[PDB]
Symmetry: C5
Subunit: 333 residues, 5 copies
């Protein structure tokens, strides 16, 4: 029997190796396989990865006439001591079990142990949509021991920044992923003490042009169309009102559609400011004509060319819109 | 074997410590990790937290030459007695088990025991939307023993108010969370007797301005645009009907969009009252012009400036709208 | 050991108590904790409740010097005989297991047993939406034994009508719940025979006014607005067609929005009759003006005031609409 | 002990009864409890039913002084041999386990065995939407042994057609269900050989009138409304363009709403053909007027009643639409 | 006992057959049963298939007087050595267990073993929608051993290309599936070494005409309708503005509907280019009329037929649109 080469019954595996002395160093190697999905309403992302652990345990040493290693399946995990890593700030996770448990153990003759497994984890990530759609989001994934403090277990990356590998085909439907790097930081819990924590960081960016076209182009086009009505003669009363009254309806439909398409984030964003300012510029154009029409009628009654209001509007409106655009794109870059 | 130091087979662990005498005091410490999501239609929320228990049992005392404690994993839980806490008025819950069970046991030489575990719980919370979007919601989370009454298990907060801790980065997409505090109360069941119950309370608020702009601003703008038609000469018949008839369509589209965007709660809210009153004001303007056009025509037939009705309307309509706004915002603050 | 006081190994627990003789009566108590959600498309509802069983077993009697009882957790269930209740016409159900199994057992010295557990169940309920939104629905939940007929197990409510208790804070978002009561009935299966079945009944209602306002108010307003066009002089040709042609579009958008907001039930409902009848009234108003315009044009050519059609329409249309409203509200109450 | 009457340890239960000789005949009875839901996009349905098996085993015979039978729960299944039935072309299935396993075993003294259990299954069913909403779908559910061929296990319906029973209150929200019947057929697998397969067949139909009204009524109404414009004098130029240009908008909105409400099936259906042909008729009415206006204008310049085009159109358009309707309803019945 | 024919306790089954020698060849057969669904947002697909293994082990050889084989259920898998296959780049998977585990084991007298099981797997597939709706997508499913390298386990298709079978009725609601074939390739991991991988490839196509009609046809029709306005006399000022202003609204509604119906892929597709270029053509037609009306008024004031702009537009606009169509359909084929 292979398990008889390891003195399983002659050793206690309920305690850590090197009990009562210096901590046992444990190395971790992570390989990212894919990114499944990201949810903006609930602010979470899903990841699939390979997790590996390295440590040395002298109780598992077995004699041999060569350097061949022995491979065991997941059934040996319950009989020996293994590190209990867990993911912080996670919502749910599981280990794949098709067609059997995806757990592997490899033991060297001296006693070096390799522990590999495949896991899928969902983690939280705080997001800020103030600068939508020009926003940049940074998320992270954290790994930490559960029950052992730094006095008993010393956790670290095995090969520095070479311990993180990513698949060549990792991609998202609506985001750009870049800048994968690893950091470490000590965390404190008042109940037990100090712990070591490992981080995996990355950054997300959007496709600016798609939002630019769809949102901003119709708004500017409709504003210019509303401007155009200033060059039509005032005497054609049933030929100037329809343009102004039919620009507002189109703007309202555009706003409703854009609101429907965007994610349900309930606070003011950068896109909302642009759309509601443009709505006022269209609204004021109709108010301008009512004043012109009213003043003309008063003169006719009193007494019985181009009005100066139109001349001033043709210059004032484009300047105001250009100044607003300059300020808006200077603030939001 | 570390389990041989504790006389597991020399004691019965089917009964609480100190059976037949005074109840064993059990303290609870809770640290909130995050709020996952909140549902308005189903009226529930999801929370992730750490749960810790403190109690003393002399049967677990073991001799030692120093003050060191022994740490055990989740496999020892089934061999000893632990309190059976559960969350009242919950819909679903589970304990995280990646990469293994998130259960820790720590035993002091004197006999003090620490039992910590990590759990996610979904709980119900009644909500009132009569004052939407100016509503305030209060939700609570409750903990209680299942099978032991107050005569057997005395449940209390270990450090009073200081037993609750919260994360620094806990937030919600569409709500503001504040006022975390803890209270206790006795609960009675006719079948078995009295129980001790613990509470965790918090309050939720919305972002007023986002709803204010989106909902209220277009309605007021359309009402003013409808008022504008009172200043146009009545002789321009195909230049005054379009304004009135195209304000109604815009108002209807705005109402439909707002209803679509809001949650599907089927009773009258504070927002719905405002929108449907404004619709009537737009509707009454159209009828007013129909009366003027009819009366003016009758004069032409009988016989073969500005009409009094328009002069009165110009003053009557804004005063009524201002009075309605004052009363509405006085009632709903 | 507590399990040694009960002669577990001296009795056979694969057979019911009193085997070979009269049936064992079992009492049932139910307390409804909350109603989670209801689905109209799939016609089912979710409930959380407490289930309690009472029966007498002489094999569990143990001597004592007093009248104290012993409380056991769920690990003893597998060693004794317990009734196998199940829910009829259910879709899915489970027993909560946080932080451990929610099962309690209490045994009296004489031999009376109490078996309580906490369960969440989803059950089906047929619904009829012919009279929406004036419909009333009756749903029920049924409890029955699985393998034992009435010859072996006699199931009944322990305290008659007083065996059902409901929480004070049970409510639904879009329905009103009332009239909780319990009944019993015999059922027959050809495979084994008769069974006793228990019922829990309740009724549901809607908020009439919310649907009334939203659906019916705009339709009536648009119909009256279409009527208003009869009082405009026929000579204002480009001032009367737009009103009629713009009422149809508003009515169509209202109908589309109503259909969108409604649940996806694909057969004729009461509200659909009202809306599509009003669409005919709006459609006929446009055709009425076309007949007037054509006849006027014929006279002008032939030869080279208020037309009778308008005068008759002003009286005919409101009377027909009032008659339709009276009949419709008499049929559907 | 009840299990000691049956010589469990004296027989090998890893082999089928009558091993080495003729196959054991197994009968099947099915009772349908309810139909849960149907998914048109994924083309599958969910059903709940009772499954019963009948077979004879001499190894389970026990002596008795009477003819009473012994009933066991699911804990005896793991010690004896039972048929390994499974559902073909299924996606997911499970057995209900509240408050315990819904498995029953009954043994007659001679050796007859009954095996009943309650199971919920989701199965695939290909659908064709070419003739929507006048389409008819046929679905089926199949039962077959997994490991035993026809040489070792012979499967058949116990009571012919009378083996299928349906609940009185089975129905669907949007479909009509009828024609339940059962058939059998042999299946071949090259890896192992021949197998027996059992079928349960039914047919589905829709509500024609709900779709008829909703879709077809507005399209015909708008087409007739567009026809109406042919009777208005050509000189009323700003009274004839609006009708034609506002009918196209209503038609487009109706088409968009209908497409949104219907299921997302991405190929041409019978309803789509009717709506787009009606869109062409409304479109051509606008072009017809432009030709009339241009030709009249041509004469005015050259030189300086009712045009023939209107007279011919008034007859040509209705005849073409009637012919299209006749052909369409002849092809699609 | 059947398990006593195989010397289970006389051999160690924690090591592969022929340990220390040449690699053991394992053959694989796959039969595809159905394709459940496909998700374009998350870029994945679900498949149900049969998996079969072939290998030879002398330790399972048993004496016999004939060539009959013994069939075992899933309970024997835990006692012998079986290959640990797993699916690469998968998100979730499970093995069906109704009414029991769908695992079959067959052993020949000489020692040949057959291992079949039924599994459902969800796998990722990268998609590119740059050419929507005329895109072509290729997906694959990959199988690989987990813990054994090529030095110990050699994986291959048993009968080459003939080892893949597909059901006769496999189809998708909105895709066309074709070109099933199999390949092999070696993969390298730096942790352990080379591995063998197996592939299953297929291709998906859409229904061109459904998207063609719905999207493209209304855009072309509206562009031609906007072209129509060039043939109407300029003096009919309130007879051309409504047409131009009502084409833009229809185009906007069509674009909004198309955006709503399409999957939420956030980058520019081939469909978006066509719709927004057409929207510009409609916009320019309105501005063209503004120049005509302005210049005409200038002449009347200064001084106190068909303008050249219309004459040039009648030829310029259709030619530009035809050139754009030719280029667009040349680039995107
Ligand atoms: C969707 C809507 O509801 C709007 C969108 C475009 C609008 C039209 C634009 C121009 C005109 C011409 C005018 O006649 S006139 O001789 O006085 O010019 C009468 C009014 C009419 C028919 C409008 C009616 C309302 C609309 C259909
Ligand atoms: C670096 C190392 O481990 N070398 C060993 C060597 O010492 C040993 O003699 C041999 C036995 O075959 O296996 C190898
Ligand atoms: C321990 C270590 O080398 N950490 C570095 C980190 O400082 C750097 O930011 C990153 C790439 O930017 O690569 C890694
Ligand atoms: C407060 C306390 O527990 N103090 C103890 C002390 O009494 C004991 O002698 C010592 C043994 O190392 O451990 C510590
Ligand atoms: C037992 C106790 O101290 N309870 C208090 C509670 O009364 C108070 O409301 C809360 C903060 O408001 O802090 C805690
Ligand atoms: C009603 C009842 O059960 N009474 C009993 C009594 O008979 C018994 O003597 C006593 C022992 O302490 O416990 C109590
Ligand atoms: C057995 C019994 O008392 N049943 C009654 C039932 O008849 C009655 O309808 C209900 C309240 O209405 O209360 C209960
Ligand atoms: C048809 C049948 O099984 N009849 C039996 C009968 O032979 C037997 O004597 C009796 C014993 O009580 O039970 C019954
Ligand atoms: C074996 C047998 O009797 N099968 C019949 C089948 O032929 C018939 O079609 C169905 C009802 O139509 O009833 C059953
Ligand atoms: C090809 C093969 O396996 N043939 C065998 C034959 O050698 C053997 O004598 C017989 C026993 O019945 O079974 C068969
Ligand atoms: C090993 C082998 O024969 N592979 C072939 C592959 O090359 C070919 O492309 C496919 C059908 O196209 O059939 C298979
Ligand atoms: C009429 C619209 C004018 C738009 C002008 C855009 C100006 C962009 C300035 C960018 C500054 C970084
Ligand atoms: C359905 C298409 C109807 C087209 C009507 C054309 C009428 C042409 C009349 C020509 C008279 C000179
Ligand atoms: C593909 C780039 C489309 C750019 C549209 C113009 C946007 C102008 C925003 C002010
Ligand atoms: C006379 C019309 C001028 C149009 C452009 C106005 C100036 C733009 C830059 C301020
Ligand atoms: C209190 C809500 C009233 C809404 C108007 C009811 C109109 C009924 C006539 C259809
Ligand atoms: C305009 C409506 C004409 C309807 C004709 C229906 C004929 C059906 C033939 C089967
Ligand atoms: C480009 C299509 C526009 C057709 C307008 C009507 C032309 C009539 C010519 C007799
Ligand atoms: C003068 C009217 C010409 C109408 C046909 C124009 C066709 C242009 C094709 C480039
Ligand atoms: C936008 C309204 C302008 C009104 C100007 C009135 C100046 C007398
Ligand atoms: C942070 C708000 C920026 C708003 C810019 C408005 C410029 C007129
Ligand atoms: C108490 C609700 C009043 C709603 C009035 C809406 C306008 C008729
Ligand atoms: C339009 C007047 C608003 C006044 C608000 C007063 C709130 C107390
Ligand atoms: C109800 C449509 C108009 C009917 C006119 C009848 C003329 C004789
Ligand atoms: C729109 C109706 C036109 C035909 C009217 C016939 C009146 C006799
Ligand atoms: C507006 C008429 C209402 C009539 C209601 C009749 C109820 C029996
Ligand atoms: C509007 C035409 C109805 C034709 C009825 C056809 C019934 C199958
Ligand atoms: C990638 C080319 C996009 C061009 C968009 C043009 C919109 C007017
Ligand atoms: C868009 C066409 C412009 C043609 C200008 C010709 C000026 C004579
Ligand atoms: C209307 C232009 C169509 C061009 C088709 C080109 C096909 C290669
Ligand atoms: C914005 C309008 C300006 C008019 C100045 C008289
Ligand atoms: C709003 C209607 C006014 C009528 C005055 C006679
Ligand atoms: C409403 C129809 C009136 C007809 C009068 C002759
Ligand atoms: C868009 C056409 C403009 C022409 C100006 C002369
Ligand atoms: C908006 C029309 C401007 C024309 C300038 C020549
Ligand atoms: Cl006019």
């Amino acid at each position: 029997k292979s398990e008889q080469l390891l003195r399983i019954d002659d050793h206690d595996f309920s305690m850590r190796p090197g009990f009562g002395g210096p901590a046992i160093p444990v190395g971790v190697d992570v390989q990212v396989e894919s990114l499944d999905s990201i949810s903006e309403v609930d602010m979470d992302f899903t990841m699939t990865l390979y997790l590996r652990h390295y440590w040395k345990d002298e109780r598992l040493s077995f004699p041999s006439t060569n350097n061949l290693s022995m491979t065991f399946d997941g059934r040996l995990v319950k009989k020996i001591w293994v590190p209990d890593m867990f993911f912080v700030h996670s919502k749910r996770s599981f280990i794949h079990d098709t067609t059997t448990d995806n757990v592997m153990l490899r033991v060297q003759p001296d006693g070096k142990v390799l522990y590999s497994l495949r896991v899928t984890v969902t983690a939280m990530c705080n997001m800020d949509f103030s600068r939508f759609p020009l926003d940049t989001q940074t998320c992270s994934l954290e790994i930490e021991s559960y029950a052992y403090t730094e006095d008993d277990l010393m956790l670290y990356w095995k090969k520095g920044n070479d311990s993180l590998k990513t698949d060549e085909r990792i991609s998202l439907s609506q985001f750009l992923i870049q800048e994968f790097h690893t950091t470490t930081k000590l965390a404190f819990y008042s109940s037990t003490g100090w712990y070591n924590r490992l981080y995996i960081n990355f950054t997300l960016r959007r496709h600016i042009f798609f939002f630019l076209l769809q949102t901003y182009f119709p708004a500017t086009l409709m504003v210019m169309l509303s401007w155009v009505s200033f060059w039509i003669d005032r005497r054609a009363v049933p030929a100037r009102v329809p343009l102004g009254i039919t620009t507002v309806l189109t703007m309202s439909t555009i706003i409703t559609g854009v609101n429907a398409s965007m994610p349900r984030v309930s606070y003011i964003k950068a896109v909302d400011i642009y759309l509601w300012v443009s709505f006022v510029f269209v609204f004021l154009s109709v108010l301008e004509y009512a004043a012109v029409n009213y003043l003309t009628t008063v003169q006719e009654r009193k007494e019985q060319d181009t009005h100066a209001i139109d001349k001033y509007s043709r210059i004032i409106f484009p300047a105001a819109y250009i100044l607003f655009n300059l300020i808006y794109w200077s603030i939001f870059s």
